[PDB]
Amino acid sequence: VQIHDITGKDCQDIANKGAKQSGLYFIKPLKANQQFLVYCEIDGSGNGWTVFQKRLDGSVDFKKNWIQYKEGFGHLSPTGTTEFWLGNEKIHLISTQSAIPYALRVELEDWNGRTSTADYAMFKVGPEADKYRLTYAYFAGGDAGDAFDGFDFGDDPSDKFFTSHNGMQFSTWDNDNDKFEGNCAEQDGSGWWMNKCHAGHLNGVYYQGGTYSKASTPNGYDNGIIWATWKTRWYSMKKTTMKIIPFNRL
Amino acid sequence: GPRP
Ligand SMILES: [Ca+2]
């Protein structure tokens, strides 16, 4: 292990104090009773992103329950080569500290080497009392497209209405808070901000190769790691990163 | 994706 000494409210505070290496740092957001390890992605321009989700090789099963998604799972590595979910409580403590305006960057990688981005301005994750609801002001751009706005796959007219993510509470197979009369989290095997059900799903099943069929899932669920706006629902991503930085850094 |  190798956590760095400089600490802060987040990874940007950390970069502001001079840290120039990406790695494990301790941070203690405004309402954190205690500090905690995070992986900071620090680029040359002083930008310090607090990474809260990472997918890259299929080593961790993302079908976890409420308490597991609340507390975090997977492993943090100084080299940034492990998969993990920081925890809904920590993501909440950071994104809502001191009303600081945060931007969320979703970074995606192909099975063909191509990387795409999608930024969301004023990103926040509510408290447990409101089931860690996801809310943001507006899409700030990026080539991955805006999957969080919903998507008209074609299946129905209300598809868009039903696959948008803004305002959605979090759902795990054992804590269904979606807008579907079935259980989305349970049938797609993940923990996510489900509507009915999704156009962007980064905690889905890791499918080797990207392209996958309706058969690879007996009940025809499109449950891969998809971002409807960039790739087909039958294309599971190679790598995904969800990280946050104060809006002004954009 | 969507649902019924
Ligand atoms: Ca339901």
Side-chain angles (χ1 to χ4, degrees):
Chain A
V1 69
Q2 187 193 353
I3 333 96
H4 299 227
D5 260 330
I6 300 177
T7 184
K9 57 170 171 62
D10 59 52
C11 290
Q12 187 50 42
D13 201 13
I14 282 177
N16 287 346
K17 304 180 181 192
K20 301 186 178 63
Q21 306 309 342
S22 292
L24 297 186
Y25 291 80
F26 271 105
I27 69 166
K28 199 203 220 98
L30 214 198
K31 284 304 167 174
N33 326 55
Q34 218 44 67
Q35 9 160 259
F36 47 83
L37 235 307
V38 300
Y39 175 85
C40 298
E41 207 179 86
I42 299 167
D43 64 42
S45 299
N47 289 339
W49 306 81
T50 304
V51 178
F52 72 82
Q53 189 258 32
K54 189 97 191 62
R55 298 299 289 281
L56 40 72
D57 65 0
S59 46
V60 185
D61 185 21
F62 274 64
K63 197 214 185 194
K64 296 259 185 287
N65 69 41
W66 192 262
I67 296 195
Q68 306 187 305
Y69 262 106
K70 163 177 186 163
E71 313 206 311
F73 55 88
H75 345 246
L76 289 173
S77 60
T79 50
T81 57
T82 50
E83 299 196 328
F84 65 93
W85 181 255
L86 188 60
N88 280 334
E89 186 67 23
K90 288 165 199 172
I91 295 164
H92 166 50
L93 297 179
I94 304 153
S95 69
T96 67
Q97 67 180 320
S98 293
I100 302 175
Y102 286 93
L104 153 73
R105 173 162 292 187
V106 164
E107 194 176 286
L108 308 173
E109 197 182 307
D110 235 5
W111 283 96
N112 291 274
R114 303 189 253 106
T115 308
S116 77
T117 61
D119 300 333
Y120 290 84
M122 263 64 94
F123 156 90
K124 302 172 307 158
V125 168
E128 189 165 42
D130 185 34
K131 305 298 198 180
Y132 300 114
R133 180 194 239 100
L134 174 115
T135 60
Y136 65 87
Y138 64 94
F139 178 67
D143 43 355
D146 187 7
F148 282 177
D149 195 33
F151 185 92
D152 197 280
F153 292 88
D155 292 41
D156 205 50
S158 298
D159 283 347
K160 189 120 179 169
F161 177 84
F162 290 137
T163 65
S164 61
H165 298 276
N166 209 352
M168 291 304 119
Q169 293 189 302
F170 202 71
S171 300
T172 49
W173 63 265
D174 63 322
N175 216 311
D176 182 356
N177 305 289
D178 67 20
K179 296 253 171 293
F180 175 50
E181 332 109 87
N183 185 336
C184 292
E186 182 213 77
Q187 49 193 257
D188 289 5
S190 60
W192 197 242
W193 294 281
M194 300 301 197
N195 187 353
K196 176 179 166 120
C197 288
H198 58 84
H201 185 235
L202 310 171
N203 290 356
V205 175
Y206 198 93
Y207 285 99
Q208 209 191 3
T211 290
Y212 66 101
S213 55
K214 185 188 305 286
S216 304
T217 162
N219 280 264
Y221 324 131
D222 73 301
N223 63 349
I225 300 173
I226 68 147
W227 194 259
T229 46
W230 196 35
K231 302 286 181 155
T232 173
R233 66 208 290 186
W234 298 111
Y235 190 91
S236 205
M237 314 300 349
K238 159 75 179 290
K239 305 199 197 189
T240 75
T241 316
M242 294 183 84
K243 53 197 171 157
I244 56 175
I245 205 172
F247 180 63
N248 73 120
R249 305 297 311 178
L250 295 185
Chain B
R3 281 297 192 276

